[PDB]
Amino acid sequence: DLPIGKDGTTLHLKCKSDELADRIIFVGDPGRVDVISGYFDKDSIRASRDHREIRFATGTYKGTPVTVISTGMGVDNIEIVLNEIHALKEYDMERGQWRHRKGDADAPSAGPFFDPSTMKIIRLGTCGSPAESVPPLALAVTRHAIGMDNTSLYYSAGTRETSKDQQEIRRIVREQTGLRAIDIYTSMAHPNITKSICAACDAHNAATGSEADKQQYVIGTTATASGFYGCQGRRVGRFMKHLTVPNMVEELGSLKFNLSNGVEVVTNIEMETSAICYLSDMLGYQAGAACVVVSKRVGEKKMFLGDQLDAAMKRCIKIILEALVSA
Amino acid sequence: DLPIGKDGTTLHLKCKSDELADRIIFVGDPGRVDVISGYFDKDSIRASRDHREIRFATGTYKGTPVTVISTGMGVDNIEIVLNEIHALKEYDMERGQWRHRKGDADAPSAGPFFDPSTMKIIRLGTCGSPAESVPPLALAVTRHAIGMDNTSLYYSAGTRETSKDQQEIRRIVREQTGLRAIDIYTSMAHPNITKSICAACDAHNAATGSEADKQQYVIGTTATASGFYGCQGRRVGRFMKHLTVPNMVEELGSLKFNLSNGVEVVTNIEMETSAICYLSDMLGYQAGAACVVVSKRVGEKKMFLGDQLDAAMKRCIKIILEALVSA
Ligand SMILES: O=P(O)(O)O[C@H]1O[C@H](CO)[C@@H](O)[C@H]1O
Ligand SMILES: O=P(O)(O)O[C@H]1O[C@H](CO)[C@@H](O)[C@H]1O
Ligand SMILES: O=c1cc[nH]c(=O)[nH]1
Ligand SMILES: O=c1cc[nH]c(=O)[nH]1
Numbered sequence: 001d002l003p004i005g006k007d008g009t010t011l012h013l014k015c016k017s018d019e020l021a022d023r024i025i026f027v028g029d030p031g032r033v034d035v036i037s038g039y040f041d042k043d044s045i046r047a048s049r050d051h052r053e054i055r056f057a058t059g060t061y062k063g064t065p066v067t068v069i070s071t072g073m074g075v076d077n078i079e080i081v082l083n084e085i086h087a088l089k090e091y092d093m094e095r096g097q098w099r100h101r102k103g104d105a106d107a108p109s110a111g112p113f114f115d116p117s118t119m120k121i122i123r124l125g126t127c128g129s130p131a132e133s134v135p136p137l138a139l140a141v142t143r144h145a146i147g148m149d150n151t152s153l154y155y156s157a158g159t160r161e162t163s164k165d166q167q168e169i170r171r172i173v174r175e176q177t178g179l180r181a182i183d184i185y186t187s188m189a190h191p192n193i194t195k196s197i198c199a200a201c202d203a204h205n206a207a208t209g210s211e212a213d214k215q216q217y218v219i220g221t222t223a224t225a226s227g228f229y230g231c232q233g234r235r236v237g238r239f240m241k242h243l244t245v246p247n248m249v250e251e252l253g254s255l256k257f258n259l260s261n262g263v264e265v266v267t268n269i270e271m272e273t274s275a276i277c278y279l280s281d282m283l284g285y286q287a288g289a290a291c292v293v294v295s296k297r298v299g300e301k302k303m304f305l306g307d308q309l310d311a312a313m314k315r316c317i318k319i320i321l322e323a324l325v326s327a
Numbered sequence: 328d329l330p331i332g333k334d335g336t337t338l339h340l341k342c343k344s345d346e347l348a349d350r351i352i353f354v355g356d357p358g359r360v361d362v363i364s365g366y367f368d369k370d371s372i373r374a375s376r377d378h379r380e381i382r383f384a385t386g387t388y389k390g391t392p393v394t395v396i397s398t399g400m401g402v403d404n405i406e407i408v409l410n411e412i413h414a415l416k417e418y419d420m421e422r423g424q425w426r427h428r429k430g431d432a433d434a435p436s437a438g439p440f441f442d443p444s445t446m447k448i449i450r451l452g453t454c455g456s457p458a459e460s461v462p463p464l465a466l467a468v469t470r471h472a473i474g475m476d477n478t479s480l481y482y483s484a485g486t487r488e489t490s491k492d493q494q495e496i497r498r499i500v501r502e503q504t505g506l507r508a509i510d511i512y513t514s515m516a517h518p519n520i521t522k523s524i525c526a527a528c529d530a531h532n533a534a535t536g537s538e539a540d541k542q543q544y545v546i547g548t549t550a551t552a553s554g555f556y557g558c559q560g561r562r563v564g565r566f567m568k569h570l571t572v573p574n575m576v577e578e579l580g581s582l583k584f585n586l587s588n589g590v591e592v593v594t595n596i597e598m599e600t601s602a603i604c605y606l607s608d609m610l611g612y613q614a615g616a617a618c619v620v621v622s623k624r625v626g627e628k629k630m631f632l633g634d635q636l637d638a639a640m641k642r643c644i645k646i647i648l649e650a651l652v653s654a
């Protein structure tokens with residue numbers, strides 16, 4: 001059920017309990033781990049290991065412990081890494097038992113108790129945007145999420161009650177897009193994470209009088225896919241006539257969600273966020289996501305890679321580290 | 328929709344058309360690429376590049392061109408790599424168009440025509456088995472496939488007609504397991520691939536009298552998951568109470584499919600094979616899978632990693648190379 005090495009490491013993420021911080025940045029690309037850890041406090045990296053697509057490094061930022069982990073691509077990879085983080089934080093290997101939480105029936109009244117709210121997890125990724133308004137290389141910050149994948153369906157996502165706002169998102173997506181064919185699920189980033197990210201963006205821009213060092217951002221719904229091409233409505237060769245949702249981008253882009261705190265739109269599409277939000281919330285860990293827009297699927301109809309991306313990612317790394325330690 | 332750089336490479340797989348063989352081995356673990364390429368003919372490796380979890384090397388095996396590609400984990404990763412292989416093989420950059428196939432309405436009478444059956448793609452992976460009879464470190468060779476993931480739902484898998492045998496598998500899975508809650512799909516490895524793999528196993532075993540060097544194998548149905556833990560029925564900490572299919576292993580292990588070529592059982596569980604089979608068949612490419620059983624989920628209830636795995640994987644690499652060039 002949960003393979004643990006003789007060295008106390010989990011199976012994919014080769015990290016031991018005492019090497020993992022409560023505050024974690026997820027990146028998809030293993031290459032981004034070294035870029036991020038370079039921003040950690042000088043000589044603070046105390047643990048690091050690489051295996052498959054899964055790399056980590058743990059240091060400090062402004063004195064607060066932080067771990068950066070590459071997950072590789074997809075919600076399936078997320079499911080792996082979050083299960084292993086769960087075991088590293090809450091399975092006491094020394095005693096061979098799961099840690100108590102407040103409210104456990106047969107726990108001693110003294111505990112000790114593990115507080116899941118101490119876990120803060122933020123994805124810093126890349127993404128596409130179906131929104132005409134959203135600029136190239138903007139930071140798209142997740143509030144709600146649409147799971148077009150099915151990973152969380154194995155964790156009762158199809159039956160567990162959701163908020164009124166999430167019910168409205170699901171209704172609109174099911175009625176007004178080709179996802180009518182899919183048992184989609186929803187989730188939401190923890191409000192504390194979304195707020196922290198936005199505040200960090202604001203602080204960044206306020207701290208520079210150079211227009212070139214500004215970072216644009218947007219907040220909205222992130223749609224997460226179980227692939228990159230047809231799974232995101234890309235039309236490729238001999239596959240295109242077989243697509244279930246060939247007009248995914250335009251369909252998602254047309255949506256407006258009339259939600260409790262105002263109107264929300266689908267700001268971005270990527271491959272991890274839905275499961276990060278859902279599985280983290282299920283565990284009581286605070287999670288969210290922010291992704292640099294590298295593909296404009298409308299308007300510009302371009303990709304934005306290379307130097308421009310590198311510069312945007314440098315700004316966003318600092319913003320996310322700031323948000324993470326202030327959460 | 329299909330980004331191809333000026334260097335002629337696709338976005339994730341960093342291979343040029345002229346560097347990719349018609350015969351391909353897929354591995355999940357990027358580490359396995361170097362292990363496999365070491366079995367290529369001496370001084371034959373002519374192209375290689377790494378990016379994210381996606382590594383390749385192209386050489387020859389007994390004179391036939393072969394490429395090994397790591398996909399990383401999951402059907403989402405497969406969707407990426409197969410789309411990119413499709414473009415590299417069938418998008419003609421010099422013509423600015425997709426290659427003609429026989430049957431195309433407005434193709435020139437003489438073509439030329441790309442023959443998709445020239446593509447031979449075999450996954451060599453690791454897996455779990457829910458089958459009591461399947462020995463540890465056996466090679467589980469895919470005939471039929473169950474997609475417990477949803478990647479191929481984006482390619483009409485939920486509505487496209489399937490064979491009588493696949494209809495029966497779906498019926499039995501829905502009848503007798505908690506997967507009735509999921510719009511599961513099915514596929515099948517190409518018969519030529521299944522047969523070639525089995526023949527290579529038989530040839531390996533006939534060539535040695537050393538019992539310690541025999542490779543046991545089974546042929547059957549591979550169930551593919553959108554994760555590793557709850558998505559494969561593993562029970563982990565605070566997730567366990569929220570599983571949709573907590574008895575997945577016992578339920579899958581109990582199934583018998585009374586199919587046209589005889590009785591078939593679920594031999595193995597892993598993360599890539601359903602989409603490999605489904606998407607390749609959709610393209611007309613010949614594909615299949617063979618995975619070393621590293622997790623016995625019933626009976627033994629153990630993992631089989633380390634030197635024992637290394638020895639089995641060495642045998643199986645040679646077997647799959649033999650199968651691949653004979654296909
Ligand atoms: O750049 P990363 O963080 O991987 O994120 C995005 O890029 C990958 C696909 O190219 C997917 O992982 C997607 O979510
Ligand atoms: O060993 P590889 O080829 O990655 O295959 C298996 O191992 C991974 C999970 O550990 C998944 O990719 C699964 O399909
Ligand atoms: O369109 C995009 C761009 C980056 N990552 C994605 O998953 N999709
Ligand atoms: O049980 C297992 C073992 C390896 N790979 C899997 O996907 N599952």
Ligand SMILES: [Ca+2]
Nearest residue numbers: 073074400401
């Ligand atoms: Ca994946």
